[model samples]
Target: FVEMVDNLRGKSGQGYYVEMTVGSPPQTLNILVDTGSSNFAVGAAPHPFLHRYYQRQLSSTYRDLRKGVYVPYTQGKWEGELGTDLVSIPHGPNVTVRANIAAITESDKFFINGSNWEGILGLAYAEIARPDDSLEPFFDSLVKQTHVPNLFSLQLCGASVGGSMIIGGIDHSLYTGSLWYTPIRREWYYEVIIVRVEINGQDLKMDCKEYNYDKSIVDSGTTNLRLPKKVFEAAVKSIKAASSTEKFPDGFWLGEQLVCWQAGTTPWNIFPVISLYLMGEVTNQSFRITILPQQYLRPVEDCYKFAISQSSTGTVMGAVIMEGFYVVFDRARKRIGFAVSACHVHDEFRTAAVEGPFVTLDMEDCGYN
Candidate 1:
């Protein structure tokens, strides 16, 4: 069954917060749970956007060194005001811990929706601050500093039920069924090897006259399944064939020639199953997890163009796969695990493991819950 939790909101002070240190002092600030992106950020004093939100505390215990830090993004770059502060959470009266916080300055992208949440708590295993690799994620540090297993899980429920993200440890209750885990590929990021890809049981030939066996990162933050260009085209062809007659004018626009099949028709649901093999295991079990009905597909020619036809085909493995299982990102061990109903076991294991730097930098600068 899908797990649902409360939506942690952002207020002036105290709601859902994380503790981090700037310089030497620890501080806490309300944060948002964003699944669309992998990195986290914070607002700092003297920033252009600070006046819009409330300042809970200022710390001399932390040093303000805005001139020393540099952060770069696809659109622009900024130098953050660096300092350390204490963080505390009110799970109850006596539950609190000192954590580090990075106060950002000189950037317009720090705060969320005009709220006091100075920064974001990126749950994925990667460094969001300073990009020079100087900053460490709160959960990554917690695993090392606390000398305990550093792990966390997100139960992102449907919009109607809402959901929550938990930090520090994995909740055993989250996995109600069998635990399906794939071995990790040793690289700069957590990746896994993809032995092959099959569409509706038909093995797809990799376009590379020579198929280079590769690996991928399982990213929950992403919305679509991403794959190599050639492989993506072949898969698209299979899906299109199944969705041919039901193609609606407003359905997905893959590119100039490529088209997206609508899932509304019976033929669309009967489309060939897409599966990825990791360590000889078939990961995609059923259409319920990865296939989307025709209503959600959108065609943006610029990004979706495949090289041959100027359209693109790689899948990002986003919401299509996330809905049916409880995904686990165990950074320390460098592995990706899934917990799904018995029906989904085969597909989950066979579906190609996403290969990457693991975390992606391409996305809109917005907060998610």
Candidate 2:
């Protein structure tokens, strides 16, 4: 009974965004949810950090469908044309979906400079939709014109501490215990299976298929937490032997640098707790998440970057480790779930962990694909 709720802004490298309403007397714009692309796209022409765009001749229910979409990203890319309008999410699942947008008339680095989102819903599915799968995403046309229950869930809350995205069900008050699910090695982007990572819980033993070789995505439009460059050089050589004298600055773990710290200092207690693990939903079991160091650190003004990165392809938990979990996705039972973020606490202290069903690593392809 919670179709869609919407209320997300950004932080932690500025990403999450919400506020919908397009076409015919609507046009609200602030999209950018991105479960790693399926294209709901927008920004219909205009650049310079866009604060607005998507007019579509003032949508009287705009419909072009002239077909000509391009997509591409690990950073940015857009090129739109295909259309069809009348959408709505008056704060989520209010239903009105005509869906299959794209409109974006060319872009690169995909809307930057203080972006508050001009468009990019993409909940994922339809085999990387873009001129494929007969075009459908926008939460699969809001779960088939609102019959609801194809599943969707999130709870970012990082930057200015605000987040919420429920799309169809399971709002069990924003998460607390036992969600853990996994298995979804392919629905395209929701792909899973890592089988190992641990940092403070120790064990960078490598070769758990090198953290799923060329695939381990979770991505909510990625913001950091990528790995796989030999697991980011064995997690910076075990976080430099467990933050030993904490020197920092090998160009700040190769993101090229940034580490201010002073005013009331908080290098997040000398960094360390970074679990991950995956491969659950049963069979030999395994599920852990962990994070910490305030979810990999990235604040900006008082300086602090290194939200962890490297990925020469595959292994991206993103949103700096999914803002510490409470992510579902279920997609008609293909599986994803996580649970543990209630806004990931901090004052009352609760950094994030999610635990597991444990015992696993006999690896059967380890999600090969």
Candidate 3:
């Protein structure tokens, strides 16, 4: 049971964590729940920055692999050595997962400095693991050896606590309806080729029906919906927006790409919902991954940045969009599932009358434009 707890203040340290033990005495480290990469390394050099990291000197079963690793993300990179150790997560049968895979450290890098998370637990495939591409991630091993399933579901709590990541199973309590399945385009990330994007009921001129550079990744690790600058610009233009007249720091910003409104506002107070059209590879069904005003207008104490722009490097639907829906990464069936999550539905998105995704909805309240 990997609990999805959050430090909503954003400054206090936000994201999900799992209590996993390492070494002989079994030191418990609360690692960040990440799906973007497959390298699990802890203890940032000279000293542990966020939380206390693994001390190789304290471990009895620790093996020295001598090999070093480098993991590059959209911003930062991780460097560390490889080794084998005894690992354990709380759940199912009581058994320690001993394998050849191990965990890394960094510098002034904000991921190491300004964050409360000590390490990252990669939930991606073996195709992307560091030091050795053949290395399997911890999640893969759990499904193989333990009673755990090959699939996992994430219900993130952006406003409060009490969310979870159920391994090998789905927690029906977090979501509202049936899980609509979509397909994975890449083996590395939770890749999906977005079929089309609609802003204010009108489809933008993106040639996603053929599927090319429009490959979008559904990642829990990231916090914003990143797309080509042109797409973001057009989408923002299409929607009335909460419309910011200023740029970052001066206003709501998701890094440097997006700027939005101050809090006390709901999705209905902003622009219409933006829907990502994806063609499920397994069912070959064209379904909607809609980020409603309630979903996009994250209720932060300070402000809410619903979406952002990526100068390049493809498309990504991050946690901001994900927290709105119950996302299931189905490995065995080879597809992804999105059902409506009931947790964060605001009164602004609820109005009497109509059939829709939640009790029913189309952009705003309960009506379609």
Candidate 4:
């Protein structure tokens, strides 16, 4: 019943990351907490004096598939070599995931943001994987080799590095109320049909609702929730109507892809709650995803803004909305579940990160037969 725990580390006001080692006799790297894509890749800078990177030639377990892959993201593109090796996580009884594969990328080509992440570990379904199912997603391999349950959950806290992830199984104490379940509409990226969205029992009237719109993807890789421009504008309009403010602070479009209000008072006390409901009859057991005002506002300097916007033509639910729930990914059951997170409140989080220097005697054995 043991699991993989992705201890959420990194900038508190920004996003989360995990510390892990890649290859046998592994070299540690700060991995991005990404659940959107597959294939673990590292940045190889041309300058030997640059930051530490994956030196493919050094690892004894590194394998050359004599193949290269190109992957695209919302921000940029990734070009690298396809390779297989051992990847291990340091925690608990020290377990390892087997048949691990990673991509060794050209450093100059890796165009990530200000994030100092060395690479990213894909946790979503393998269907979205590049090279068309050539390699298994991290979680998929984890279940098959470890005999652990096909499950994983995330608890991302706002302040400090208070966040922790439990792989293979759910952490019973992380959430409060009963865990609500919803079927995965699609396997690409935890897609689900949010039949109706409400703001304090009042319908916010989202876009593409005409035909029971489906196309919402839950992505923890992103820090903010992204919606279609039209939907975002309307959401701000609804939020303003519920608040005492004469107009939405910053009057929308605070920045290219962000909106904020005067962080004068706490958001929960100022803004109304937003609720997302899945398709089904009216029942208490039915699932409902709640986005509280506090989660959207968070604790930032000066202004408190809704960390959501029109970042794409489609809809994406990110960490900002996930902070309130102890989300569970039941890959075995083809569904996702969540409950009111016990550590959802930020005031209780701790400070000064660094999860593990991990005195791990190199990599853990996958022991896959």
Candidate 5:
């Protein structure tokens, strides 16, 4: 029998605290929940000169406990002292966990733009500490010291909608389907074998033999389903073949393309089906939205010159594919599952409400308008 409990729910961008006990005395600090990257880190002392937009909750608890701090970015560095304390998540039940806290003392770059978040709680499997590193991950330390389950789960809502990350154990209530069993690799990550991909009932003769376990990561933060380069190309090819005459806009990719199909030029009923065969199981599938039109396609020289180029390889599933399904990440069982649905009604489930395949943002002079 499945255990039922009230789903613990929270909104995105809301300030919450995670309690942490560093050593002898426990100190608690509030941190922003981040699912985009893995690693649980708090603010450091001599806190960098933050922008006005950056929200800082000057907690007396945080200020007092901060000892040492360090912030390392891809390009630069910020350093401070580490503080030991019991961290507590706001709005969460009175659960206190221990962690090494940081106080910012000095820094050259202070402002983190576009990121409204404070510190982050990384959910991915990567280790927060480096080799020969003694420090434990904030969540890992909590489970070890408290004998709690070493599992955590996140139900991230859409961009504007709210969602939450549940620590300790799985929320059985959110899961409705059978748990698919796949073996986890030696490292703390899910590894699955892909046998083939079927497009509209036809086997696209692509090389699945070369595809291996090193390519995939079972990421809970990622909403849409992503595929490797080979898989992505095949999917694009299959979808384009199915809708030959469809016109797409420059830079306007899947969103507008899927809209064209719905506009009545195509019956839309005959849209092709794309299926993913994992370990011989046709576990996942979705239709191709559409490609950027040829008119929008820039010359190779012009396209490759961007300072930050869009991903040329690998597919990002994002929130687009998360609609209409109950997705489960089973760490203990070592697999991920998805159940199709028109809507997800769980009160604690924070993903956006899926209205349709395409979100109608606004009408332009073009046909979508």
Candidate 6:
């Protein structure tokens, strides 16, 4: 049996979230489903961003484990006390799981202003768990308590439609065609290998090793398809060369400024489709996951922002690319699967597509050393 979770729209620009309740009284909260980190923390005290917070005092079964936790993020960090309580998911596994909870007391810009999520639900492995892996993560606890298969799949339908994540098994109806797989190089963040990046069918033509400078991972928490500074500069330069007619300020590519046009006059056709080449499961073979401008040119208030950014911490295949495909986290098999998501749009403007099994006879060893 599989756990079919009905995920809600958490705005396409940010991340997707799920609804889960904690404690004996079962206080429901919107949790950001993050694959990048492992810390099931919630806003326990009043926060400028959260309209409501988890009140441990209200729960009859809440217990303070007395351990402290600190989770760091972009320009922010959350400090909390480790605790435990009965947790249930309205649209999750049938059994109510007794899980670890990091009750956040102090947060410095962790929860941004005007954000929809009140807490973060980490789905990664125990190796990256906060305060150490002595405590079980939420997904691990759910799978353990339910006795389901050790696997889950995610489908993030763009901004307009809500997607679904099925735990313990895959739903054939959610995706199309055969699934292409990539081996998980490390247990730490669903880390994978990359051969190179392509823009509009043209390869970046750099040393393949540079593509995985710090190691690449499929992270749902990050909003963009972050690349190492070298890869990012190459990608930006390729985009510039591809669409040389359009002139935008340098700040636009730096992510410090936005480019705007009259509401209906957005120039998406001029942009090129970005493709990420990945190491395939079979020896001497490779695959690619491509995203259209619709996925990268993020829409703001009558403006658009560049969705791909430079990262010092290696490459990150964030929502910008994941939103275009159906991803499977098959930890039990030590492999990750990718398929064309049924939710992908295919009108006059194509949003997502996948291709692979290309011969890698000449490709060098791009794997982590």
Candidate with maximal TM-score: 6
Worst 10 residues of 4 by lDDT: 360-369
lDDT of 3 by residue, 1-369 (tens): 424322121221266666667778887776777787776767635554555777877888988877777666656666777777888865323568765445465533635465556677888877878866677787777777776668887776554343567666776777776677767766777777666677656887755532225446777777667776666666665654434433235233334334444453333644566777665543334667666665555545445554555546567677767777877899888788888776645465542111122221121111111
User: What is candidate 3's local distance difference test score?
Assistant: 0.62
The residue-by-residue lDDT of candidate 6 on 1-369, one tens digit each, is 234645656875657888889997889898888888877999999987797799998999998898898777668888999999998877766778789999999989788687788998898988899878778898888777888789988888763436787777888888888799998998888899888688998988988888998779999888898999988998999998888769889999889998888758866778899988888888889898888887888778467889889988899998888878889999888899999988876557655777877877544478657
For model 2, the stretches where C-alpha displacement exceeds 4 angstroms are 1-31, 35-52, 62-117, 120-137, 140-197, 200-241, 245-274, 287-304, 308-317, 320-330, 337-369
Give candidate 2's TM-score.
0.34
Show model 3 residue runs off by greater than 4 Å: 1-13, 44-48, 91-94, 99-105, 108-114, 159-162, 209-214, 241-267, 281-284, 299-302, 348-369
TM-score of each: 0.62, 0.34, 0.81, 0.81, 0.58, 0.94
Clashing pairs in 2: none
Q: Which stretches of candidate 6 lie over 4 Å from their true place?
A: 1-6, 159-161, 349-351, 362-364
* Tens-digit lDDT track of model 2 for 243-314: 875687678878787877677677465678888888887778887888787777767756778878787777
lDDT values, one for every candidate: 0.43, 0.80, 0.62, 0.63, 0.40, 0.84
Provide backbone clash counts, one per model: 61, 0, 5, 3, 45, 0
User: Of 3 and 5, which scores higher on lDDT?
Assistant: 3
Q: Order candidates by lDDT, high to low.
A: 6, 2, 4, 3, 1, 5
Q: By TM-score, highest first, what's the ranking?
A: 6, 4, 3, 1, 5, 2
Model 4 has a clash total of 3
Clashing pairs in 3: 40-103, 41-103, 41-104, 149-168, 356-360
* Per-residue lDDT value at 232 in model 6: 93
lDDT score, candidate 6, position 203: 87
Off by over 4 Å in 4: 1-6, 46-51, 107-116, 205-214, 246-268, 280-285, 311-313, 346-369
